[PDB]
């Protein structure tokens, strides 16, 4: 470990009175055979780094827990890639497997922001089991998979939208508000689509997510930067980056 702590015992033996926290190793060393629990993403120049945590994703409970659906495009731990699928030899515990996530977002130097746990909703299993119809058992899970994939897809597409909008407006501070309000607002829509209830933008009945939270992303993005797009400069740049949310956008 990179640290070295010690506990000073109390005479009772069931209490700590003092402690020591300091460096245990001073020469750098990166661990080979990357951690199977985390999700890793590659940047330019060849370095591979873990995707950092985001309190903005914990604005709704158990958001990352649902990664058991998907999966997802490079966004998947190897431990799952070697224990959750069928290329392994579990037989019936796999039909009750649930994911959990322990996240503690922090700055890489010494400042901490927040922790949060995320256990997947067993209700999403209940819905798939309660109907006992093969075609409906597959249509439901297809609807959750679809809604989740597209949900995070527009989440990251909105992140780059706000990063380029603010980084180009001045020639950022909008990502925090935009994302926070975007997930906070877009998750009740998710639960709205899973129970095939009339959601904003699109009514039940259709195949997938029906392209609804995309409209939720237009709402959050349009309001977080709305009061600031008055003069034509900010208006044209904000709009130029606002013409991306309109994709995928598969029509009726």
């Amino acid at each position: 470990f990179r640290h070295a702590v010690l506990l000073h015992p109390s005479p009772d033996g069931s209490h700590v009175v003092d402690a020591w926290v300091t460096w245990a190793w001073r020469e750098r060393n990166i661990s080979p055979e990357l951690d199977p629990y985390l999700i890793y993403q590659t940047s330019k120049e060849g370095r591979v780094y873990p995707r950092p945590a985001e309190a903005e994703r914990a604005i709704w409970r158990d958001l990352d827990a649902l990664l058991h659906y998907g999966e997802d495009g490079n966004y998947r731990p190897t431990i799952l890639d070697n224990c959750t699928p069928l290329a392994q030899v579990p037989q019936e515990v796999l039909d009750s497997l649930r994911l959990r996530a322990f996240g503690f977002d922090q700055d890489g130097q010494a400042r901490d922001k927040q922790w949060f746990t995320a256990t997947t909703p067993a209700v999403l299993r209940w819905l798939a089991d309660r109907e006992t119809d093969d075609n409906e058992n597959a249509r439901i899970v297809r609807r959750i998979t679809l809604a989740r994939k597209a949900a995070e897809a527009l989440g990251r597409r909105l992140e780059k939208a706000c990063k380029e909008a603010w980084k180009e407006s001045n020639s950022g501070p909008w990502v925090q508000h935009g994302m926070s309000r975007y997930w906070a607002k877009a998750e009740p829509v998710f639960w709205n689509i899973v129970y095939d209830r009339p959601a904003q933008g699109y009514t039940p009945g259709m195949a997938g997510p029906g392209n609804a939270f995309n409209l939720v992303a237009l709402a959050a993005y349009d309001e977080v930067t709305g009061p600031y797009c008055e003069r034509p400069r900010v208006a044209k740049v904000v709009e130029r980056h606002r013409s991306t949310l309109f994709s995928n956008w598969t029509p009726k």
Partner: protein, 244 residues
């Protein structure tokens, strides 16, 4: 036995899992919060045993979900170089770096109809009618609804949440009934979260995990109020027959 609190007002924020600057709230009330409110209405100082508040049941019907807002909150700024919030060692920070900035989130413009069912519910109600400390909703600065206790005495108050309780105006199709409203009971559970309160003392806050299951129920459309000024009116006439 039991009574029906009406969780409403300008702002609500039931926090959880946040022990740092950034504070967040849940999209629905947490029993730790409202049990803290009952405890504040009965006069139990932090550190006292909260066993009395065990054996209670809280099903909550969400009227409207309400929208989440982030409250920026700086504390200690602008003050001179010799007045801020001290450090543990006692050595203050430089005034350019002295204030601490917390961005505490909160839930705004939402109204919940909780249904308390417990053995001590009658004294709890009579405590909310006259408390030994300002009762709040989530945090001190949030002032509760005047009609904090909608109905004081009702047998099987859950059935009262399923029928004959006013709801705020929402889009209702023509001659349509069976309008869905979500209520949370506590298999097929939605999530687990630290709600059960074990100790409130500031020296060692201690909580535990608790199950929660959100069941979307159907209610007849005869409860949706009108466009404006109708909802508060209908709930007033609803609280009028409380004596009867």
């Amino acid at each position: 036995s039991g009574f029906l609190l009406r969780l409403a007002g300008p702002m609500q924020s039931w926090g959880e899992h946040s022990m740092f600057g950034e504070r967040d709230t849940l999209p629905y009330p947490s029993r730790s919060g409202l049990i803290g409110m009952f405890a504040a209405a009965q006069g139990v100082r932090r550190g006292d045993p909260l066993d009395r508040y065990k054996e209670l049941k809280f099903t909550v019907r969400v009227d409207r979900p309400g929208v989440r807002l982030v409250d920026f909150h700086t504390i200690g700024g602008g003050l001179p170089k010799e007045r801020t919030v001290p450090t543990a060692a006692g050595e203050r920070r430089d005034p350019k770096k002295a204030t601490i900035v917390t961005s505490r989130s909160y839930l705004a413009d939402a109204v919940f109809t909780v249904a308390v069912t417990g053995p001590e519910a009658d004294t709890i109600a009579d405590a909310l009618a006259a408390p030994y400390w300002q009762p709040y909703l989530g945090r001190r600065a949030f002032v509760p609804d005047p009609l904090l206790v909608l109905r004081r005495r009702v047998a099987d108050p859950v059935r009262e949440l399923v029928e004959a309780v006013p709801l705020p105006h929402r889009r209702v199709e023509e001659d349509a009934a069976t309008v869905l409203v979500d209520l949370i009971y506590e298999t097929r559970t939605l999530t687990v979260l630290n709600d059960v309160p074990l100790s409130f003392d500031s020296k060692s806050r201690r909580y535990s995990t608790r199950q929660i299951r959100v069941v979307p129920t159907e209610v007849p459309a005869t409860l949706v109020a009108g466009p404006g000024r109708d909802y508060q009116n209908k709930l007033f006439t609803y609280v009028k027959q409380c004596a009867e």
